[PDB]
Write a protein that binds this DNA or RNA. Structure first.
Lengths: 114, 53, 154
RNA sequence: GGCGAAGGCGAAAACUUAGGCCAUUACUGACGCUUAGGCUUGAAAGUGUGGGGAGCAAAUAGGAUUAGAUACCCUAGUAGUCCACACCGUAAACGAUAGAUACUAGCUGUCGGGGCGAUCCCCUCGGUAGUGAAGUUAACACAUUAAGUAUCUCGCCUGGGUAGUACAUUCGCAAGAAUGAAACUCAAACGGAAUUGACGGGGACCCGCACAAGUGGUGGAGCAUGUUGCUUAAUUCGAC
């Protein structure tokens, strides 16, 4: 029911999540790897993120969307297959942005696994 | 990091924005000593000296 | 490690004029005896001619086309509980696997005589039953299920 | 890259404050180097009192792998890491190279002061690096910022295991710090450098029925034959 908006993709190094959102900030629909069939360690694959973005793009096509912002977030190899699927799904993408949670050198991160 | 005009010329430049974001963020997710911080910083600085010149 | 090796050339069968028939007559071969496997295959073709009246070449081509696999699963282990990677398979290997499956599922069934059992195998393959189409579809289902591994693989 | 004597110092401002470099037609006129004892500073961990606690995380609990795992992995998780006043005075507190001074090829950078002056580059005096001969070294290597040629002073060493242990002493509430042996034992040592092999669940490259692609085989039964074990008078001896 809304022409414009922002759809977010978070690419964790263990999972991926995509969430459509109204331009006001509130979300409209969202899917992820877990919502689909395969789960576990097999869900951190570029194919998983690609199909996750494909599903949300398809279900927002019936939701009546148009040119939409896109905020990639997180570190991981699945953040590009979602981009390609969004481009291939037939969307009206116009703007690309990056919204990583980049910190200034403040709080201490967890320890090195070794 | 907003930049996009029509289809792909901005995406080709997105790769560079992300790679460097990834490199800088990768050292804020594991903790190691300050001495090692400086040592790896100087080692990375040597690497630029070898290729970029 | 070695280098690529040459592949020999198969002569066409000089009665029915089809190389796939030669590949059948060589894959069903045992003991190295052409005069026996040839009788088996040509009696099977005669049986095809008699019941369900139809040119044997058409049934053969239909069965072979329905049996050829689209993808092939090749084992590539990294650690314990090894995972599989689907891989694309060339057309020559496609027909090789198809004819292998036809022959090997033919020589395991009821209807004791080899003639009738292989004739039923080829008839069922033409009619898309669970004889060998089921196995082809099972190994095809094993593909594109691990397709996440297939996309990023070597 | 800069500074500090060392530890260390990196968001912004204010106050206080330390030392350093260049030029000096100025001044005192040997007032200089080193330093036993002494004094001051001195990473982190730790301790006493009062606050603080977002994240992280010894100890601890649970889930995994393993034969075991009190470890590596994962989820929780206190002391602590933070601040105010003291105490502890140890580190690979490393340039494994004490301080002060005179002299000894050169080349390539870089930083500051000065003159010249659009930067760049000219050069002078300094600080910080690389390459490099005579010279030194057992070799690696150092080589004008010396491990070179020499002097002055201090500290320290005299085989290894015993052992930085024991006693005594001083300091500290504290864990400990400083100083620090001997009895016994070995002919060598968790000695140094370098050389050739061998090895690496270290890299790079290259072959083979090695893997991969198939065919047909053994381990399932009977039989032949050989071997091990047992037995008897020997079950001749060898091959493992």
């Amino acid at each position: 029911n809304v022409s414009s908006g922002i759809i977010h993709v978070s690419c964790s190094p263990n999972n991926t999540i995509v969430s459509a959102s109204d331009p006001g900030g509130n979300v409209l629909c969202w899917a992820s790897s877990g919502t689909m069939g395969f789960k576990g360690s097999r869900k951190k694959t570029p194919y998983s993120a690609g199909i996750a973005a494909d599903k949300v793009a398809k279900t927002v096509k019936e939701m009546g969307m148009a040119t939409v912002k896109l905020f990639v977030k997180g570190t991981g190899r699945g953040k590009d297959t979602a981009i390609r699927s969004f481009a291939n799904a037939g969307l009206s993408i116009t703007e690309i942005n990056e919204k990583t949670p980049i910190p200034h050198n403040g709080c201490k991160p967890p320890k090195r696994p070794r | 990091e907003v930049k996009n005009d029509d289809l792909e010329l901005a995406l080709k430049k997105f790769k560079r924005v992300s790679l460097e974001i990834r490199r800088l963020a990768q050292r804020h997710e594991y903790h190691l000593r300050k001495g090692m911080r400086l040592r790896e910083k100087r080692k990375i600085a040597q690497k630029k000296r070898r290729k970029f010149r | 490690r070695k280098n690529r090796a040459p592949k020999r050339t198969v002569l066409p069968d000089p009665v029915f004029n089809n190389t796939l028939v030669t590949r059948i007559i060589n894959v069903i071969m045992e003991d190295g005896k052409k005069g026996l496997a040839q009788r088996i295959l040509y009696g099977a073709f005669d049986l095809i001619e008699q019941r369900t009246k139809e040119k044997p070449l058409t049934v053969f081509e239909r069965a072979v086309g329905n049996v050829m696999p689209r993808l092939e699963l090749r084992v590539r282990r990294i650690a314990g509980s090894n995972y599989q990677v689907p891989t694309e398979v060339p057309q020559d290997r496609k027909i090789a696997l198809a004819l292998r499956w036809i022959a090997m599922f033919a020589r395991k069934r009821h209807e004791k005589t080899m003639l009738e059992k292989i004739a039923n195998e080829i008839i069922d393959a033409s009619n898309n039953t669970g004889a060998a189409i089921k196995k082809k579809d099972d190994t095809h289902k094993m593909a594109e299920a691990n397709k996440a591994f297939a996309h990023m693989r070597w």
